[PDB]
Amino acid sequence: RLTSKQTFASFQQWAEKAEALGRDTEIGIYMIYKRDTPDTTPMNAAEQEHYLETLQALDNKKNLIIRPQIHDDREEEELDLGRYIAEDRNARTGFFRMVPKDQRAPETNSGRLTIGVEPKYGAQLALAMATLMDKHKSVTQGKVVGPAKYGQQTDSAILYINGDLAKAVKLGEKLKKLSGIPPEGFVEHTPLSMQSTGLGLSYAESVEGQPSSHGQARTHVIMDALKGQGPMENRLKMALAERGYDPENPALRAR
Amino acid sequence: RLTSKQTFASFQQWAEKAEALGRDTEIGIYMIYKRDTPDTTPMNAAEQEHYLETLQALDNKKNLIIRPQIHDDREEEELDLGRYIAEDRNARTGFFRMVPKDQRAPETNSGRLTIGVEPKYGAQLALAMATLMDKHKSVTQGKVVGPAKYGQQTDSAILYINGDLAKAVKLGEKLKKLSGIPPEGFVEHTPLSMQSTGLGLSYAESVEGQPSSHGQARTHVIMDALKGQGPMENRLKMALAERGYDPENPALRAR
After folding, report:
1. Which residues in chain B have Cβ-Cβ distances shorter than 8 Å to A92?
2. Contact B89/A23, CB-based, under 8 Å?
3. Cβ–Cβ under 8 Å, residues A244 and A206
4. Where are the domains of chain A?
5. Residue B89 CB: number of other CB atoms within 10 A?
6. Least CB-CB distance to B25: which of A32, A93, A213?
């Protein structure tokens, strides 16, 4: 797991694929990363219904708020998850933020941990993420995708963590334990350019000031490199250096 | 249907949503358009298998090739749709291109017609699209999404057409008739900034030299508008005009 070889290799494969496909826009490059589909079995009607029941429950807690990303414009007073899940069918597909009632600010040294489980275990993992968030203040936020798309694109469950690679390895294994999810419940998949840290666990450090929404930071590195001449590897290493990443590991901040 | 009012209005709602959410990147603005979900019922497992079977069958037509977008880097003699469907999980989720054997180039006057049906009619629609392409050279290409994501984002089935609004309105009605899908099987849904041309039918024109992959052209107008000052409506119209669109109707080319 913890070697930079595959991490850089997948990043190069992503960038070479974009050049070979003829993609030359941010959206076009990003979709290669995003639509990279893991082998999963979707939730049935019952499971999807149960998944949304779980989210509503977490929202009715005193310390945790569950809000769709499409509601980022709303004051906390205007949030209505019940009305959302009942009326807005983006509830089946969009991402929901899991946000602790104490806010917890991202500091300069933060990253994202992506967790892949079979969709039937999605509700269970969500509960575990909430539990991990109660005790560990280093975990600032979580995100889970709607049930209809759970397991059908490169990520479905993400934690934002203040800290470094070491902290994320520790927290990932602690999450696995807390979850009670069997080893067969976790999905072997590493999104392109992310550091695999374990079965179903993947990590990337953020660099302050780089575009971060929807996980798009590494797209911009590739965009720079696409303007260049030569074997892809060098163009990537220099683009990584210029934007503050480790040139030998695109998942990490420079030293 | 054929009024500019709604078309400009949904475009302005998109841009206002982007500003309210604080989205300020191409991907972040694009996702508001893309993740806008219509109310549909997903395919069951038999229906998904049938759908993939239909696709594989269509590729056996002598004047038609079905190729996934992720194979844009392949020469025709490198394609293997059968192997892709059996072995690549992207086949469940990715877009498939429907491409004529004798290449019809997209012209300066070209647009997209987006067609929305309940996922259980998706296979029937694909058959209808392929047949439309046998008869009409004006239709240069078609795209349909993998079965697991059919009906789960703003678009699932698209035709590329050389011609204008009138041609699109006509081909759309023809396609609906041709398909034998019942009126009830079409989905009321217009992707943001597209011109509604009928129940389940939406259209937009491309401007020479604007970015079009993944349907992303109008995202760039919004990025322009978000950098400016004043009421959004005025900023959008200026941005529209500068990039070659009708200021009163964002789905149309100028003049």
Report:
1. 37, 152
2. no
3. no
4. 1-255
5. 17
6. A213
